[PDB]
Amino acid sequence: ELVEIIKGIGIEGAKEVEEKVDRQFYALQYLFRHQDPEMFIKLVIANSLVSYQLTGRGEDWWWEFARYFSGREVDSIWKAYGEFLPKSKNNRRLIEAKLNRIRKVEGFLSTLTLKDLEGYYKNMKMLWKALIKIMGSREDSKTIVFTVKMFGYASRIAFSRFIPYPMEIPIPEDLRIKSVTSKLTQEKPTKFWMKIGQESGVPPLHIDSLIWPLLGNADLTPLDIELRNKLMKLTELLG
Ligand SMILES: [Cl-]
Ligand SMILES: [Cl-]
Ligand SMILES: [Cl-]
Ligand SMILES: [Cl-]
Ligand SMILES: [Cl-]
Ligand SMILES: [Cl-]
Ligand SMILES: [Cl-]
Ligand SMILES: [Cl-]
Ligand SMILES: [Cl-]
């Protein structure tokens, strides 16, 4: 049933919510046109990896990020964040750990070309596994798979090309996702939405784009009526 609504929405349904509704995707389009493409992608990757335990709303954090780096020539991402995070409104917590995470991913990013980034976009499972190893993280880390997701947005924008997320990458299990999964099952959300994903044909990183909006009574209006009614039906089933 849930499976049917999500299959009916499909990848293309998720693609539309991402490109018309998702406020993080919009934040990224904003930054892109005011940044070097290579640095833009690398910054989104670094930003994602420290987007946990925020001192603000997720959507405000990503706009703050967008506006801060718009116009800013960046030499060292690590240094940029050393200045950025302590001054920030929405991410002013666990700064020592986050800067060290940035220091750590930056070594990796600094070796990559725009072409490398593009190859990783054609091979998102490989970016996934690479980050797991440079960061020393669990495969199902919510921060790791959110980074792959945002990398997807960034690369979608920069390379003008839609590539769906791999079926294999689990949903980012943050509190909101934990919440909605409560009223449906007792299994781990990472495990549950993989199942829902396998049957509906919609990769769990795309499913995530469907759940998180229906949760803040957000915009629906640049969408198509049929998609909206599908989205309205899903909000019923979730509760
Ligand atoms: Cl589809
Ligand atoms: Cl949030
Ligand atoms: Cl976030
Ligand atoms: Cl704010
Ligand atoms: Cl405020
Ligand atoms: Cl701190
Ligand atoms: Cl810390
Ligand atoms: Cl290049
Ligand atoms: Cl764009």
CSV table of C-alpha atoms and ligand atoms in Angstrom, one decimal:
chain,number,residue,atom,x,y,z
A,1,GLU,CA,0.0,0.0,0.0
A,2,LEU,CA,2.7,2.4,1.1
A,3,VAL,CA,4.7,0.5,-1.5
A,4,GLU,CA,2.0,1.3,-4.1
A,5,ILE,CA,1.9,5.0,-3.5
A,6,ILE,CA,5.7,5.2,-3.7
A,7,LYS,CA,5.9,3.1,-6.8
A,8,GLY,CA,3.3,5.4,-8.4
A,9,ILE,CA,5.2,8.5,-7.5
A,10,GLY,CA,8.3,6.8,-8.8
A,11,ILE,CA,11.8,8.2,-9.3
A,12,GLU,CA,10.4,10.9,-11.5
A,13,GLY,CA,8.1,12.0,-8.7
A,14,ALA,CA,11.0,12.2,-6.3
A,15,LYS,CA,13.0,14.1,-8.9
A,16,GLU,CA,10.3,16.7,-9.2
A,17,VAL,CA,10.1,17.3,-5.4
A,18,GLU,CA,13.8,17.6,-5.3
A,19,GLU,CA,14.0,20.1,-8.1
A,20,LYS,CA,10.9,22.2,-7.2
A,21,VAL,CA,10.2,21.8,-3.5
A,22,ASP,CA,13.4,20.8,-1.7
A,23,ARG,CA,14.8,23.9,0.0
A,24,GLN,CA,18.3,22.3,0.2
A,25,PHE,CA,18.4,21.8,-3.6
A,26,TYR,CA,17.4,25.4,-4.0
A,27,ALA,CA,20.1,26.5,-1.6
A,28,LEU,CA,22.6,24.6,-3.8
A,29,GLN,CA,21.4,26.2,-7.1
A,30,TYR,CA,21.9,29.6,-5.4
A,31,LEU,CA,25.5,28.8,-4.4
A,32,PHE,CA,26.4,27.1,-7.7
A,33,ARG,CA,26.0,30.3,-9.8
A,34,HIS,CA,28.3,32.2,-7.3
A,35,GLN,CA,31.1,29.6,-7.0
A,36,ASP,CA,33.6,27.7,-9.1
A,37,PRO,CA,32.0,24.3,-10.0
A,38,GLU,CA,34.8,22.2,-8.6
A,39,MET,CA,34.9,24.0,-5.3
A,40,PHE,CA,31.1,24.1,-5.2
A,41,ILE,CA,30.8,20.3,-5.2
A,42,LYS,CA,33.7,19.9,-2.7
A,43,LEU,CA,32.1,22.5,-0.4
A,44,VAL,CA,28.7,20.6,-0.5
A,45,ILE,CA,30.6,17.4,0.4
A,46,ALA,CA,32.4,19.1,3.3
A,47,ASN,CA,29.2,20.8,4.5
A,48,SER,CA,27.2,17.6,4.5
A,49,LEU,CA,29.8,15.7,6.7
A,50,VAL,CA,29.3,18.3,9.5
A,51,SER,CA,25.6,18.7,9.1
A,52,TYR,CA,24.7,16.9,12.3
A,53,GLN,CA,23.7,18.2,15.8
A,54,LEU,CA,22.9,21.6,14.3
A,55,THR,CA,22.1,24.7,16.3
A,56,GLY,CA,19.4,25.6,13.9
A,57,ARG,CA,16.9,24.3,11.3
A,58,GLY,CA,18.4,22.2,8.5
A,59,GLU,CA,16.9,24.4,5.8
A,60,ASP,CA,18.3,27.6,7.5
A,61,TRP,CA,21.7,25.9,7.8
A,62,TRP,CA,22.0,25.2,4.1
A,63,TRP,CA,20.9,28.7,3.1
A,64,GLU,CA,23.4,30.2,5.6
A,65,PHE,CA,26.0,27.9,4.0
A,66,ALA,CA,24.8,29.0,0.5
A,67,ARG,CA,25.0,32.7,1.2
A,68,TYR,CA,28.3,32.5,3.1
A,69,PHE,CA,30.2,30.9,0.3
A,70,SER,CA,28.5,32.8,-2.5
A,71,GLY,CA,31.2,35.2,-3.8
A,72,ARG,CA,33.9,33.7,-1.6
A,73,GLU,CA,37.1,32.5,-3.1
A,74,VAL,CA,38.2,29.5,-1.1
A,75,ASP,CA,41.8,28.4,-0.8
A,76,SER,CA,41.5,25.9,2.1
A,77,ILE,CA,38.1,24.4,2.8
A,78,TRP,CA,39.4,23.5,6.3
A,79,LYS,CA,40.4,27.1,6.9
A,80,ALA,CA,37.2,28.4,5.4
A,81,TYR,CA,35.3,26.3,7.9
A,82,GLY,CA,37.6,27.3,10.8
A,83,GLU,CA,36.4,30.8,10.2
A,84,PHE,CA,32.8,29.8,9.2
A,85,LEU,CA,31.5,27.4,11.9
A,86,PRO,CA,32.4,29.4,15.0
A,87,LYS,CA,30.7,32.5,13.5
A,88,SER,CA,27.7,30.5,12.3
A,89,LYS,CA,24.1,30.8,13.5
A,90,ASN,CA,23.0,27.3,12.7
A,91,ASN,CA,26.0,25.0,13.2
A,92,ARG,CA,27.8,26.3,16.3
A,93,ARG,CA,28.3,23.0,18.2
A,94,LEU,CA,30.9,20.2,18.4
A,95,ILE,CA,33.2,22.5,16.4
A,96,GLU,CA,36.4,20.7,17.3
A,97,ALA,CA,35.1,17.3,15.9
A,98,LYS,CA,33.5,18.9,12.8
A,99,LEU,CA,36.7,20.9,11.8
A,100,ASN,CA,38.7,17.7,12.3
A,101,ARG,CA,36.2,15.9,10.0
A,102,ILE,CA,36.7,18.7,7.5
A,103,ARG,CA,40.5,18.4,7.8
A,104,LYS,CA,40.1,14.7,7.2
A,105,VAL,CA,37.9,14.8,4.0
A,106,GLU,CA,39.8,17.8,2.6
A,107,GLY,CA,43.0,15.7,2.0
A,108,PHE,CA,40.8,13.5,-0.2
A,109,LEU,CA,39.0,16.3,-1.9
A,110,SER,CA,42.2,18.2,-2.6
A,111,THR,CA,43.3,15.3,-4.8
A,112,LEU,CA,40.2,15.2,-7.0
A,113,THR,CA,39.6,17.0,-10.3
A,114,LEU,CA,36.2,18.1,-11.7
A,115,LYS,CA,36.4,15.1,-14.0
A,116,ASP,CA,37.0,12.8,-11.0
A,117,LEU,CA,34.0,14.3,-9.2
A,118,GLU,CA,32.0,13.6,-12.4
A,119,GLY,CA,33.2,10.0,-12.5
A,120,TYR,CA,32.1,9.6,-8.9
A,121,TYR,CA,28.7,11.0,-9.9
A,122,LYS,CA,28.4,8.2,-12.5
A,123,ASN,CA,29.5,5.8,-9.8
A,124,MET,CA,27.8,7.0,-6.6
A,125,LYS,CA,28.3,3.6,-4.9
A,126,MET,CA,32.0,4.2,-5.2
A,127,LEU,CA,31.9,7.7,-3.7
A,128,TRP,CA,29.8,6.1,-0.9
A,129,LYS,CA,32.4,3.4,-0.2
A,130,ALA,CA,35.3,5.9,-0.6
A,131,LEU,CA,33.8,8.2,2.1
A,132,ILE,CA,33.2,5.2,4.4
A,133,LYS,CA,36.9,4.6,4.3
A,134,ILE,CA,38.4,8.1,4.5
A,135,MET,CA,36.0,9.0,7.3
A,136,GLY,CA,36.1,5.6,9.1
A,137,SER,CA,32.3,5.4,9.3
A,138,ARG,CA,29.5,2.8,9.3
A,139,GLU,CA,28.0,2.0,5.9
A,140,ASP,CA,24.6,3.2,7.1
A,141,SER,CA,25.9,6.3,8.9
A,142,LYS,CA,23.2,9.0,8.4
A,143,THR,CA,25.8,11.6,7.8
A,144,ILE,CA,27.6,9.5,5.2
A,145,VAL,CA,24.5,8.8,3.1
A,146,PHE,CA,23.2,12.4,3.4
A,147,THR,CA,26.6,13.4,2.0
A,148,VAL,CA,26.1,11.1,-1.0
A,149,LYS,CA,22.6,12.5,-1.4
A,150,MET,CA,23.7,16.2,-1.3
A,151,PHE,CA,26.6,15.2,-3.6
A,152,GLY,CA,24.0,14.0,-6.0
A,153,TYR,CA,22.2,17.4,-5.9
A,154,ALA,CA,25.4,19.3,-6.4
A,155,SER,CA,26.5,17.1,-9.3
A,156,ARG,CA,23.0,17.1,-10.8
A,157,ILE,CA,23.3,20.9,-10.8
A,158,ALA,CA,26.9,21.2,-12.0
A,159,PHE,CA,26.9,18.6,-14.7
A,160,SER,CA,23.3,19.3,-15.9
A,161,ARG,CA,22.4,15.6,-15.8
A,162,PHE,CA,20.0,13.5,-13.7
A,163,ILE,CA,21.4,10.2,-12.4
A,164,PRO,CA,19.1,8.4,-9.9
A,165,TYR,CA,20.6,7.3,-6.5
A,166,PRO,CA,21.7,3.7,-6.3
A,167,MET,CA,19.2,1.3,-4.8
A,168,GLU,CA,21.8,0.1,-2.4
A,169,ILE,CA,22.4,3.3,-0.4
A,170,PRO,CA,20.2,3.4,2.8
A,171,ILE,CA,18.0,6.3,3.8
A,172,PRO,CA,19.6,8.9,6.1
A,173,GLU,CA,18.2,7.9,9.5
A,174,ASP,CA,17.9,11.2,11.3
A,175,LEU,CA,15.3,12.0,14.0
A,176,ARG,CA,12.5,12.9,11.5
A,177,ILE,CA,13.0,9.6,9.7
A,178,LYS,CA,13.1,7.8,13.0
A,179,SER,CA,9.9,9.5,13.9
A,180,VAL,CA,7.8,8.7,10.8
A,181,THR,CA,9.1,5.1,10.8
A,182,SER,CA,7.7,4.8,14.4
A,183,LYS,CA,4.1,4.9,13.4
A,184,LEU,CA,4.6,2.2,10.7
A,185,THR,CA,7.0,-0.5,12.0
A,186,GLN,CA,9.5,-1.5,14.6
A,187,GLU,CA,12.3,-2.5,12.3
A,188,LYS,CA,15.3,-0.2,11.8
A,189,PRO,CA,14.4,2.5,9.3
A,190,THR,CA,17.6,1.8,7.3
A,191,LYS,CA,16.4,-1.8,6.9
A,192,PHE,CA,12.7,-1.0,6.4
A,193,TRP,CA,13.1,1.6,3.7
A,194,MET,CA,15.5,-0.6,1.8
A,195,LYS,CA,12.6,-3.2,1.6
A,196,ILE,CA,10.1,-0.5,0.5
A,197,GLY,CA,12.7,0.7,-1.9
A,198,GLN,CA,13.4,-2.7,-3.4
A,199,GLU,CA,9.7,-3.4,-4.1
A,200,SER,CA,8.6,0.1,-5.2
A,201,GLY,CA,11.6,0.6,-7.6
A,202,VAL,CA,12.4,3.8,-5.8
A,203,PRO,CA,15.9,4.1,-4.2
A,204,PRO,CA,15.7,5.0,-0.5
A,205,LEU,CA,17.6,8.3,-1.0
A,206,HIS,CA,14.8,9.3,-3.3
A,207,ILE,CA,12.2,8.0,-0.9
A,208,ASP,CA,13.8,10.3,1.6
A,209,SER,CA,12.9,13.3,-0.6
A,210,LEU,CA,9.2,12.2,-0.3
A,211,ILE,CA,9.0,11.8,3.5
A,212,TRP,CA,10.9,14.8,4.7
A,213,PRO,CA,8.6,17.5,3.1
A,214,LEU,CA,5.3,15.9,4.1
A,215,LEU,CA,6.4,17.2,7.5
A,216,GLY,CA,6.4,20.9,7.8
A,217,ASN,CA,3.3,21.5,5.6
A,218,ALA,CA,5.6,22.7,2.9
A,219,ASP,CA,5.0,24.1,-0.6
A,220,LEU,CA,3.5,21.7,-3.2
A,221,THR,CA,2.4,24.2,-5.8
A,222,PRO,CA,5.0,24.2,-8.6
A,223,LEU,CA,4.2,20.5,-8.8
A,224,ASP,CA,1.6,18.7,-11.0
A,225,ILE,CA,-1.8,18.1,-9.5
A,226,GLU,CA,-1.5,14.4,-9.9
A,227,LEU,CA,1.8,14.3,-8.1
A,228,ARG,CA,0.3,16.5,-5.4
A,229,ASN,CA,-2.6,14.1,-4.9
A,230,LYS,CA,-0.2,11.2,-4.7
A,231,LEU,CA,1.8,13.2,-2.2
A,232,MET,CA,-1.4,14.0,-0.3
A,233,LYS,CA,-2.3,10.2,-0.2
A,234,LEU,CA,1.1,9.3,1.2
A,235,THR,CA,0.8,11.9,4.0
A,236,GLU,CA,-2.4,10.1,5.0
A,237,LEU,CA,-0.6,6.7,5.1
A,238,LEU,CA,2.2,8.1,7.2
A,239,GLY,CA,-0.1,9.8,9.7
B,1,CL,CL,9.4,7.2,-12.1
B,2,CL,CL,16.0,20.3,10.8
B,3,CL,CL,20.9,19.1,7.2
B,4,CL,CL,18.5,31.3,10.7
B,5,CL,CL,16.7,33.8,14.6
B,6,CL,CL,31.8,23.7,20.0
B,7,CL,CL,33.6,18.7,19.5
B,8,CL,CL,38.8,18.4,-14.5
B,9,CL,CL,20.6,24.3,-11.9
